[model samples]
Target: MKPLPVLNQDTVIELAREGGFAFIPKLAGQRRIALADITPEQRQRLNQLLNQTLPYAQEEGQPDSPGSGDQRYFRVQISYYSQTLRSEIVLLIPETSAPQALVDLWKTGQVDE
Candidate 1:
C-alpha cells in the first residue's frame, strides 16, 4: 500500500441551518467534528468523504428542501486538511456526492472524543 499523508488537525465538518421551518425554521443549530480530536480510523472516513465533497465547493449557500410545508433536509460544509492537500465544500445532503456516513453524521452529529 502507498503511504498516507500525515494524519492531522483543524479538519472540520460543520452542520447547520437544519431542523424545521414548520414553525419558525430552527436555522441556528450547529454540529461539528474535528480531525485532531478523533481516532485514526474515523479520520480515514473523514478523509474519504471530504474528498468526495471537494468538487462541490460553492460561493453561495446551497438550497435545502424548499418545496413542502414540512420539508426536512440540510447542508453541510466540510473541510479537509492533510498537511499535504486541503479542500472544502458546501453541500446539501442525503442527496449529494458525499458518502452515507457523511449523511449519517449530519443526522446524528455523534462523535467519539
Candidate 2:
C-alpha cells in the first residue's frame, strides 16, 4: 500500500478556526463518536480517521453491520449551533480489503488543535 498524505495539522487547524470549525476529539475506544464543525481539509482528516476506524469497528462487530447490502457507506456528520450537515463517503476499500490497516491507524495518535 502507498503512504497516505500527511495532513498539515497547523494549516487545517487554522483554516478550520477561521471557517468556524469547532474542535472535537474522541477519547474513548468504544462508542467512537465525534462531532465537529470542519473545513474541507478538516473533513479530509475526519475521512482519514474513519477510513482507519470503521473496518476495525466492523471487525469487532461494534459498527460494521450488513446494512442495506453491499452498498457499504459511511456517514460524516458535522454540526454547528444553528445547523448541521451530513456526508456519505464510500470507503476506498471493499469488504475483502485489509480493514485492519485503517482500524490500526485510526487512533494511533491524538490531534492538538
Candidate 3:
C-alpha cells in the first residue's frame, strides 16, 4: 500500500497500530479494541514530538528481520491537526520507545482531539 498524505481535521488525532502476528489469526492482538477520546496532554506531547524534528520515513526505524506475526512487534501512527503552525503532522513510530503520551493514545487507537 502507499503512504497516505499527512492530514487531519481541526484539533483532531487519528491513530493506527499494526501488529506483527500477521500469519497467525488466533492471537490476542491489540487490534479490535474500541477507540477512546484524546486527552489534552496527548495532543501536546505528540505535536511537540512531530514539530520538534522533521517528519520521519515510515520504515526508518523498522526491524530488518521479518516475523511470523507471532513476535507481535508493533507499529504506531498518529495523524494530528492542531494548527500548531498551519501545517500537518503525521508521525509513524515503530517500536515501543516513543513518548508515553503517544503510547497512551496508541493503546486505545482513535480519531479524536
Candidate 4:
C-alpha cells in the first residue's frame, strides 16, 4: 500500500480538538484483508482536517469493564457559538484491541454505512 501523508503532532492534536472527532480502525475480521493500511501520518491528517472544520475538545482513555481487558473510551466535546456538543467514542487501538478495519477505512477514505 502507498504511504499516507504526514503531519506534525501539534497539527494533529489541534486538528482533533477543532474537528471534535478522530478516526479509529477496526480489527481484521471487520474489514477486507487487501484494503490499504492507514499510515500514522494519515491518522494525524484526519485529526488536522477535523480541527480545521470545527471547534472540538477530547478526553481520551477512560476505563471500561471490571478487569484489565477493559477498553478505553474517548470523550469528544464539540461546539459552535459557545454551545457544548459532547460525544463519547470507543477506540480500539492496534496494541490495545482488534480495530484493524477501522484503520484501513480511514486510510482509504472510505466510509461504511
Please give, for residues 1-113, the per-residue lDDT of candidate 3 as tens digits: 42432333333344554556454445334332211244556655655665454345233323333444533334444433333444335565544445554554544333233
lDDT of 2 by residue, 1-113 (tens): 42332333222111011111232343112223233344666667676776577566634533332323333322211222222323322233333342443333333322322
Better of 2 and 4 by TM-score: 2
Winner by lDDT: 1
Q: Order candidates by TM-score, high to low.
A: 1, 3, 2, 4
Off by over 4 Å in 3: 1-9, 23-84, 107-113
* Pick by lDDT: 1 or 3, better one: 1
Q: In order, what lDDT does every prediction score?
A: 0.56, 0.33, 0.43, 0.30
TM for candidate 1 is 0.42
Model 3: lDDT of residue 18: 54
C-alpha lDDT of residue 81 in model 1? 67
Clashes of each: 0, 2, 3, 13
Write down the lDDT that model 3 would get: 0.43
lDDT, candidate 1, 1-113, per-residue tens:
43322335656777764444455644545677777688878888876776566456533233232343444555777676655567775777433343544455565343322
List TM-score per model, in order.
0.42, 0.23, 0.34, 0.19
Q: In model 2, which runs have C-alpha deviations exceeding 4 angstroms?
A: 1-8, 11-59, 62-64, 73-91, 104-113
Top-TM-score candidate index: 1
Q: What is the lDDT ranking, best to worst? A: 1, 3, 2, 4
Q: List all candidate RMSDs to the true structure.
A: 11.0, 14.0, 11.0, 16.5
